Amino acid sequence: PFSHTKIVGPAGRYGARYGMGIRRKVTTIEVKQRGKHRCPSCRSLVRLERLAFGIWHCPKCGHTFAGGAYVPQTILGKTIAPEELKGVEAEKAKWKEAA
Amino acid sequence: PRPAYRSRSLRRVKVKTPGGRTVVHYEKRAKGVPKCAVTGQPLGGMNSKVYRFGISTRAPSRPYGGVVSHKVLARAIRYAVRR
Amino acid sequence: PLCSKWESLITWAEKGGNSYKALEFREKLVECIVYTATEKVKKKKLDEAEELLKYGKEVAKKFNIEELNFHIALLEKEISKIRQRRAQAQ
Amino acid sequence: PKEIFLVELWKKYGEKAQVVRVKRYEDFVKLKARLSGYLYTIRVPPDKAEQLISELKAKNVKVEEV
Amino acid sequence: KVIDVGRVVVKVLGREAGRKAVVVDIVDENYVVITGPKSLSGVRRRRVNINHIEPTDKKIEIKKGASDEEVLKALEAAGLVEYMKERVKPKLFEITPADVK
Amino acid sequence: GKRILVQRRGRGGSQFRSPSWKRDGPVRYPPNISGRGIVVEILHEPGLNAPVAKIRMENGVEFFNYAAEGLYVGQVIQVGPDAPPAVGNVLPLGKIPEGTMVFNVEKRFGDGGKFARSGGTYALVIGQRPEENKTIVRLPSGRVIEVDARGRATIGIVAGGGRVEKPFVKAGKKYHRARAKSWKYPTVRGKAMSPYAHPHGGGSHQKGGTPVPKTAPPGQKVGFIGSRCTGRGCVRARA
Amino acid sequence: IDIGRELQVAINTGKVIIGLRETKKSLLTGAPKLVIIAANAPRWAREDIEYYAKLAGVPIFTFPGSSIELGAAAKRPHKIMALAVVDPGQSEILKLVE
RNA sequence: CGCAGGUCGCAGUGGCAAGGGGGACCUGACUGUUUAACAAAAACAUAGGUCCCCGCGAGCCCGUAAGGGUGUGUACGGGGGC
RNA sequence: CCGGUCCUAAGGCGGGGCCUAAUAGGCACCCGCCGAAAGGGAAACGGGUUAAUAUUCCCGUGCCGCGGGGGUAGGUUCUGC
Numbered sequence: 037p038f039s040h041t042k043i044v045g046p047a048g049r050y051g052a053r054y055g056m057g058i059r060r061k062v063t064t065i066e067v068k069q070r071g072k073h074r075c076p077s078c079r080s081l082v083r084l085e086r087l088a089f090g091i092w093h094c095p096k097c098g099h100t101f102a103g104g105a106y107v108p109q110t111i112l113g114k115t116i117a118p119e120e121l122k123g124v125e126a127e128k129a130k131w132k133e134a135a
Numbered sequence: 136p137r138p139a140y141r142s143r144s145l146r147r148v149k150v151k152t153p154g155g156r157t158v159v160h161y162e163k164r165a166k167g168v169p170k171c172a173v174t175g176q177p178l179g180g181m182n183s184k185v186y187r188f189g190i191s192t193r194a195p196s197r198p199y200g201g202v203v204s205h206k207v208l209a210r211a212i213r214y215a216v217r218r
Numbered sequence: 219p220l221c222s223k224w225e226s227l228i229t230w231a232e233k234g235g236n237s238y239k240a241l242e243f244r245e246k247l248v249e250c251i252v253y254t255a256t257e258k259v260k261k262k263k264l265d266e267a268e269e270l271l272k273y274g275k276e277v278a279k280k281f282n283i284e285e286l287n288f289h290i291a292l293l294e295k296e297i298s299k300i301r302q303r304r305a306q307a308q
Numbered sequence: 309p310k311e312i313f314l315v316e317l318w319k320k321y322g323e324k325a326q327v328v329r330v331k332r333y334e335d336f337v338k339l340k341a342r343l344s345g346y347l348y349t350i351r352v353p354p355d356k357a358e359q360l361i362s363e364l365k366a367k368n369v370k371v372e373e374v
Numbered sequence: 375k376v377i378d379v380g381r382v383v384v385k386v387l388g389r390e391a392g393r394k395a396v397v398v399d400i401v402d403e404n405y406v407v408i409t410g411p412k413s414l415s416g417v418r419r420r421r422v423n424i425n426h427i428e429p430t431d432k433k434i435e436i437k438k439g440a441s442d443e444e445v446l447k448a449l450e451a452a453g454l455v456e457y458m459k460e461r462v463k464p465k466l467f468e469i470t471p472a473d474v475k
Numbered sequence: 476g477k478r479i480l481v482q483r484r485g486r487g488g489s490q491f492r493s494p495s496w497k498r499d500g501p502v503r504y505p506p507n508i509s510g511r512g513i514v515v516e517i518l519h520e521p522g523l524n525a526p527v528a529k530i531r532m533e534n535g536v537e538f539f540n541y542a543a544e545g546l547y548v549g550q551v552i553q554v555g556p557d558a559p560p561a562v563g564n565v566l567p568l569g570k571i572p573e574g575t576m577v578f579n580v581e582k583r584f585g586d587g588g589k590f591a592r593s594g595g596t597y598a599l600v601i602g603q604r605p606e607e608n609k610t611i612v613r614l615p616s617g618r619v620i621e622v623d624a625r626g627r628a629t630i631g632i633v634a635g636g637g638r639v640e641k642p643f644v645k646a647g648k649k650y651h652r653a654r655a656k657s658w659k660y661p662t663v664r665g666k667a668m669s670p671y672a673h674p675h676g677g678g679s680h681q682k683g684g685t686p687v688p689k690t691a692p693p694g695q696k697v698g699f700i701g702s703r704c705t706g707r708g709c710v711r712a713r714a
Numbered sequence: 715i716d717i718g719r720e721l722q723v724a725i726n727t728g729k730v731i732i733g734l735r736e737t738k739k740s741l742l743t744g745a746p747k748l749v750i751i752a753a754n755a756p757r758w759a760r761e762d763i764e765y766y767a768k769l770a771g772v773p774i775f776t777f778p779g780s781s782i783e784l785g786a787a788a789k790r791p792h793k794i795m796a797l798a799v800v801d802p803g804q805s806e807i808l809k810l811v812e
Numbered sequence: 813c814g815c816a817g818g819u820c821g822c823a824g825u826g827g828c829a830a831g832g833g834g835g836a837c838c839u840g841a842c843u844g845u846u847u848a849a850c851a852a853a854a855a856c857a858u859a860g861g862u863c864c865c866c867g868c869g870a871g872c873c874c875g876u877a878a879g880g881g882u883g884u885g886u887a888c889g890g891g892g893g894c
Numbered sequence: 895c896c897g898g899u900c901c902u903a904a905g906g907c908g909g910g911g912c913c914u915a916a917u918a919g920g921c922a923c924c925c926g927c928c929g930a931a932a933g934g935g936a937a938a939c940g941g942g943u944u945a946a947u948a949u950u951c952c953c954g955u956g957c958c959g960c961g962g963g964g965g966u967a968g969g970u971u972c973u974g975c
């Protein structure tokens with residue numbers, strides 16, 4: 037399920053150091069961190085750029101925003117997002133009500 | 136002088152003189168070009184290599200000149216026109 | 219072509235009546251053509267040099283510049299010598 | 309030092325020259341007007357070179373063969 | 375259609391950016407002819423890309439191929455001479471890189 | 476000598492001080508911000524625990540705030556009592572509705588904000604006592620406190636959450652973080668010392684120390700300092 | 715009303731201009747009957763389309779999805795900020811105005 | 813970079829340059845640090861774990877005091893043990 | 895026209911103030927200044943010369959800053975093309 041490794045993929049740079057549990061934690065976080073995400077603005081499946089921890093950038097639409105340390109949106113952060121970017125869902129709700 | 140040349144702040148240029156010798160001239164690096172105040176990209180018409188300060192540069196013939204790019208100026212003008 | 223900005227500046231200055239600027243722009247256009255052609259010939263990029271020299275011939279016809287024809291003749295003499303050496307060696 | 313290509317432009321500087329130096333070659337002559345600020349050089353055909361030296365000596369500019 | 379003869383527009387690009395003018399002719403889908411008179415606002419009569427002009431709400435009544443003094447009497451009929459002399463002032467501090475991506 | 480490391484820390488040596496020249500400025504509310512503002516930048520700050528947003532108010536005043544999660548460049552935020560309780564908005568605690576997640580809470584109006592300032596943290600607006608101009612809020616520790624209703628807070632939660640879940644896998648990574656923070660890195664255990672240098676230092680089989688009272692003087696007040704209890708039994712009694 | 719299927723019918727049968735730039739030019743110079751803008755359209759494009767459509771007197775419908783799902787409903791494999799219905803050939807797309 | 817043929821020596825990475833290898837136990841996870849001048853280690857540190865004092869006018873520490881450090885900080889935090 | 899000289903960094907000093915039995919002791923405060931011959935930062939290169947200096951002397955060809963004169967484009971209610 038990785039390019040050349042079985043289970044230790046992004047953590048393969050660590051070799052046999054630091055312990056299986058530590059490397060597993062790192063792999064679990066990094067597979068989400070370095071995967072593809074839906075941009076909160078343009079909704080594109082893109083590899084967002086993490087400029088620092090908590091600072092994310094979409095290369096498609098140029099949306100720069102604040103998110104999680106290693107993932108663009110945390111579980112709590114999804115529920116308390118700004119209402120400006122949830123315009124599509126509001127339109128869907130009004131369409132389902134009126135139709 | 137000598138530690139100032141051991142530092143990499145100047146360019147080490149090797150040149151052959153008309154006397155047949157090879158010498159190293161220590162020349163300044165170019166100054167950075169002006170950037171847009173919103174996007175930070177270099178401004179067109181002002182991105183020529185400049186090696187010292189005090190050289191007057193001619194801005195493009197537009198309102199706000201070498202301060203903002205044409206994109207920012209046009210969009211701001213549209214917003215102000217509507218507003 | 220390469221010195222079209224110089225041609226446009228020459229005609230714009232002449233239309234505006236700036237004779238001094240028109241002379242300066244004519245000098246700049248000649249400098250553009252001759253310098254670029256000479257650098258091409260010194261690097262032995264003869265095809266680009268020949269294209270530049272044909273353009274310079276057209277420009278000298280259009281603007282009545284004798285110095286352009288003289289320098290083009292010198293460059294074409296050099297091009298002929300280079301091609302003769304290439305043919306002899308090959 | 310600066311280089312000029314048009315004789316009409318070059319004459320404006322050469323007429324005010326402190327000296328006009330002449331260097332000759334098989335195909336062309338370098339004429340160098342030495343002013344206070346710059347040395348203006350133009351390469352001309354030999355016949356035009358002779359005409360320009362004649363005109364400069366008429367205007368009483370010093371001419372020297374270098 | 376919005377970009378039409380007798381429409382007051384503001385040039386956004388070029389040297390004359392921010393200056394008001396009056397559309398007097400239509401060339402094609404890409405170009406129209408504007409002359410908000412050069413003595414009045416500073417926009418000399420010439421063609422312009424429609425992407426480089428921003429139409430305003432205001433519009434005046436004139437015929438196609440109208441002249442500069444025709445546009446002048448139309449603007450003075452509408453009372454728009456000072457509005458034509460005014461130049462639009464952008465607010466550069468508001469714009470962020472999202473607006474010009 | 477004989478003075479211990481915790482006693483040497485208070486002198487203010489360079490190895491114990493914070494390099495705040497590496498940061499652009501304090502992240503505090505200016506005293507008199509009001510109206511609408513524009514989020515112009517989201518930046519990383521060395522040694523801090525969250526990304527920092529730079530807000531440019533409509534009247535030209537610019538200030539640094541901690542970025543709410545989901546805040547984006549070019550956003551329009553509202554400041555003042557009339558501001559709606561949307562994310563990124565700076566509102567009085569008295570106006571903020573109950574159950575709202577805020578951050579950078581001010582204990583008194585005008586101090587700049589004190590609580591819920593780390594990445595992923597937040598305070599919960601529990602209640603409002605308007606007759607004493609107080610707001611009951613739950614802090615990140617779970618403690619319930621009263622704050623000035625005229626104070627200001629930001630709606631949302633602090634961005635950068637989950638930063639500490641990922642391990643600091645090498646000592647070098649913690650070294651590089653410590654160089655931006657104020658920590659002295661690394662630390663020697665007390666019992667690895669000699670008796671002149673630590674109360675725990677000394678014997679052939681070195682041992683830690685039992686808790687010291689709350690009245691213990693400096694140099695003696697190391698280890699457990701007036702602890703209610705210790706260990707799993709203490710955690711159980713706490714819960 | 716199936717917005718997606720009606721937009722397919724309008725594409726195949728009538729005249730539907732696709733793209734934000736083409737929609738803006740059709741609004742400025744042509745006379746489209748309807749404009750459809752994606753719900754997640756950016757602030758500048760949304761206000762540009764609203765201002766131009768208000769000037770030209772052309773109604774705007776806000777599609778209840780994003781640019782991607784608007785393009786999917788149109789059966790284009792790309793995204794669509796906005797489209798202009800300038801001829802509803804066999805579609806009922808103009809009933810979305812009310 | 814390869815193929816075919818011929819040919820010399822004791823010796824063809826011919827000098828120079830240039831890993832001996834393997835099995836098992838104890839021990840410290842590892843990289844790192846240490847008694848300048850008899851100890852380099854199994855000692856220290858380490859990431860990881862856990863406990864305690866603390867909501868900030870805090871906790872801890874320095875100063876005779878004025879005052880100061882942690883702090884341009886705020887529990888995903890500061891300090892203190894193992 | 896090569897460096898210092900100028901600028902600020904980490905930081906430091908002085909005066910006022912506050913503290914102190916007191917000072918030549920302390921410094922959070924206010925004001926000023928110092929703080930880099932490797933950071934930022936105006937402008938010079940080639941050749942020749944001496945027993946010994948050489949981007950410094952001489953020859954040639956230039957550059958920078960400040961100031962002035964003439965010509966010019968431009969201006970002279972208003973705006974350059």
Ligand SMILES: [Mg+2]
Pocket residue numbers: 139
């Ligand atoms: Mg220097």
Ligand SMILES: [Mg+2]
Pocket residue numbers: 144
């Ligand atoms: Mg530099």
Ligand SMILES: [Mg+2]
Pocket residue numbers: 489490491492653654656657658659
């Ligand atoms: Mg430190």
Ligand SMILES: [Mg+2]
Pocket residue numbers: 667668669
């Ligand atoms: Mg020991």
Ligand SMILES: [Mg+2]
Pocket residue numbers: 674695
């Ligand atoms: Mg004891």
Ligand SMILES: [Mg+2]
Pocket residue numbers: 670671673674
């Ligand atoms: Mg003791």
Ligand SMILES: [Mg+2]
Pocket residue numbers: 674675676677678681682683
């Ligand atoms: Mg003991």
Ligand SMILES: [Mg+2]
Pocket residue numbers: none
């Ligand atoms: Mg050997």
Ligand SMILES: [Mg+2]
Pocket residue numbers: 840
């Ligand atoms: Mg070891």
Ligand SMILES: [Mg+2]
Pocket residue numbers: none
């Ligand atoms: Mg080792």
Ligand SMILES: [Mg+2]
Pocket residue numbers: 847
């Ligand atoms: Mg020893």
Ligand SMILES: [Mg+2]
Pocket residue numbers: none
């Ligand atoms: Mg030894």
Ligand SMILES: [Mg+2]
Pocket residue numbers: none
């Ligand atoms: Mg140990």
Ligand SMILES: [Mg+2]
Pocket residue numbers: none
């Ligand atoms: Mg363990």
Ligand SMILES: [Mg+2]
Pocket residue numbers: 683894
């Ligand atoms: Mg124990």
Ligand SMILES: [Mg+2]
Pocket residue numbers: none
């Ligand atoms: Mg100084």
